Amino acid sequence: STGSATTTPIDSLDDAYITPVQIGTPAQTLNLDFDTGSSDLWVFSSETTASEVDGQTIYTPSKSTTAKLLSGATWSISYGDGSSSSGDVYTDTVSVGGLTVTGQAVESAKKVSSSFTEDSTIDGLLGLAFSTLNTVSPTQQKTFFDNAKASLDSPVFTADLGYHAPGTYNFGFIDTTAYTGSITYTAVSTKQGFWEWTSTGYAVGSGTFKSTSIDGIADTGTTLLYLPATVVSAYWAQVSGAKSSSSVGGYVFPCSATLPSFTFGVGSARIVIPGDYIDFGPISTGSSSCFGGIQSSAGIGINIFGDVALKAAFVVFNGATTPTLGFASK
């Protein structure tokens, strides 16, 4: 089997991407944030505290003839941005782009933090990291990809995120029309539960490539590119007036600037992020200070190849017995 679904930016900045997912019988369609940095499929639901729902579409398990309470199971998750959610668990039928998994754990939110409530466009998350990170207790549950893998034509999914435009998540096949050149594959460590890999270096603009190992994660659920302070300083030093602002929480730059590109290495190959992809617009409405898309990871503990980086590539998440990642230009 295969599946193919369009993913759409939630706003004009590409802060996140939503993908329609069918849950239950008859289908209830929710728009979920596909997140290769976590491993829980959770949804706003009829159980979510009413004051914490503000415009999201909810899953109502009592209206699904295939829903079953997973008795005793609870979940609770905290994300790198400080947001969180928690609740109980049903199993139900879940379909993405024509690919159907029966018995998928659908984690129903009883509580969500304010940033989820405040984002009316995201009805939940669909985790695509390794199932060892799934938070369900006392019986850990598998991701949608893990459950579908055996049925897929090939044990892979691909992320093709657009810049200010829709893109595609495919399951079970590699669309050879969706990228240019060849796909360069690189080793993955699953030891922390992430799609963790080592970039071979970077360049700023038309500058020379610096060969240096950068360990980080491919994370579709993180908006920006988080890299070591040395790398980030070298980038923003090429932008007149750019500075790190403690009050704003990162590097800002004059909105009048033209940003240089940023290149990252994948083995001997190179992925070029255009300068425009690094512009996240005014820090507040009407400001001439703009927020940068490349930020320091120094306070995180891990480097994060988020959407800013991934949207410049066609990315293969290869879930073979030894997982690997592939990157192609597009």
Side-chain angles (χ1 to χ4, degrees), residues 1-62 64-67 69-109 112-141 143-148 150-190 192-242 244-330:
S1 62
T2 64
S4 181
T6 298
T7 194
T8 301
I10 63 168
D11 65 21
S12 63
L13 300 177
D14 300 344
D15 281 312
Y17 298 77
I18 48 172
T19 308
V21 177
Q22 282 71 48
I23 309 176
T25 306
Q28 304 178 35
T29 298
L30 276 65
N31 297 328
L32 307 188
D33 183 351
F34 283 24
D35 181 12
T36 63
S38 69
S39 305
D40 288 49
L41 193 177
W42 73 260
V43 297
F44 278 80
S45 75
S46 60
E47 303 182 327
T48 310
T49 299
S51 63
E52 301 182 347
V53 184
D54 183 11
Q56 295 79 11
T57 296
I58 63 168
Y59 169 59
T60 303
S62 63
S64 174
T65 63
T66 42
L69 179 73
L70 186 64
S71 185
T74 59
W75 63 279
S76 182
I77 192 162
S78 313
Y79 296 102
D81 65 353
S83 67
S84 65
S85 53
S86 60
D88 56 15
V89 187
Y90 293 83
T91 58
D92 209 339
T93 302
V94 172
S95 299
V96 176
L99 169 66
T100 300
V101 167
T102 59
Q104 175 65 45
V106 178
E107 302 173 32
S108 169
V112 303
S113 66
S114 57
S115 63
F116 288 114
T117 300
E118 290 162 4
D119 185 359
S120 67
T121 70
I122 290 175
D123 303 324
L125 267 67
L126 189 152
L128 293 165
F130 292 89
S131 293
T132 53
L133 293 179
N134 175 266
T135 77
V136 176
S137 178
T139 307
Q140 188 172 62
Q141 302 293 303
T143 68
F144 175 82
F145 179 52
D146 218 332
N147 280 324
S151 308
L152 294 179
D153 291 357
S154 184
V156 306
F157 68 91
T158 65
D160 180 11
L161 302 180
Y163 168 65
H164 297 171
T168 305
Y169 282 101
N170 291 330
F171 292 83
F173 71 107
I174 288 161
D175 178 356
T176 60
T177 73
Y179 58 87
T180 64
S182 57
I183 305 177
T184 295
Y185 289 86
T186 196
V188 164
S189 173
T190 65
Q192 297 192 82
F194 299 117
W195 292 93
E196 188 172 358
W197 65 290
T198 302
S199 173
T200 49
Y202 69 99
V204 175
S206 57
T208 61
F209 186 83
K210 175 75 170 175
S211 292
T212 184
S213 295
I214 306 172
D215 181 289
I217 65 165
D219 186 1
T220 60
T222 289
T223 312
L224 307 184
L225 173 53
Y226 295 86
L227 292 169
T230 50
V231 179
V232 176
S233 184
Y235 177 81
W236 289 109
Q238 297 304 311
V239 179
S240 283
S244 183
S245 171
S246 55
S247 60
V248 175
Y251 280 90
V252 297
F253 68 93
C255 294
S256 59
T258 300
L259 297 177
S261 65
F262 184 87
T263 300
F264 65 93
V266 183
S268 54
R270 305 290 179 252
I271 299 298
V272 178
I273 305 168
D276 287 351
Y277 290 28
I278 299 162
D279 181 0
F280 280 74
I283 60 169
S284 299
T285 303
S287 176
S288 72
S289 183
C290 273
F291 199 68
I294 295 178
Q295 298 293 347
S296 178
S297 64
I300 299 176
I302 199 159
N303 299 304
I304 306 174
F305 294 86
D307 299 333
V308 162
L310 303 179
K311 77 179 71 180
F314 179 86
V315 189
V316 179
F317 294 79
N318 169 29
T321 301
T322 299
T324 65
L325 280 166
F327 293 81
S329 296
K330 64 187 187 190

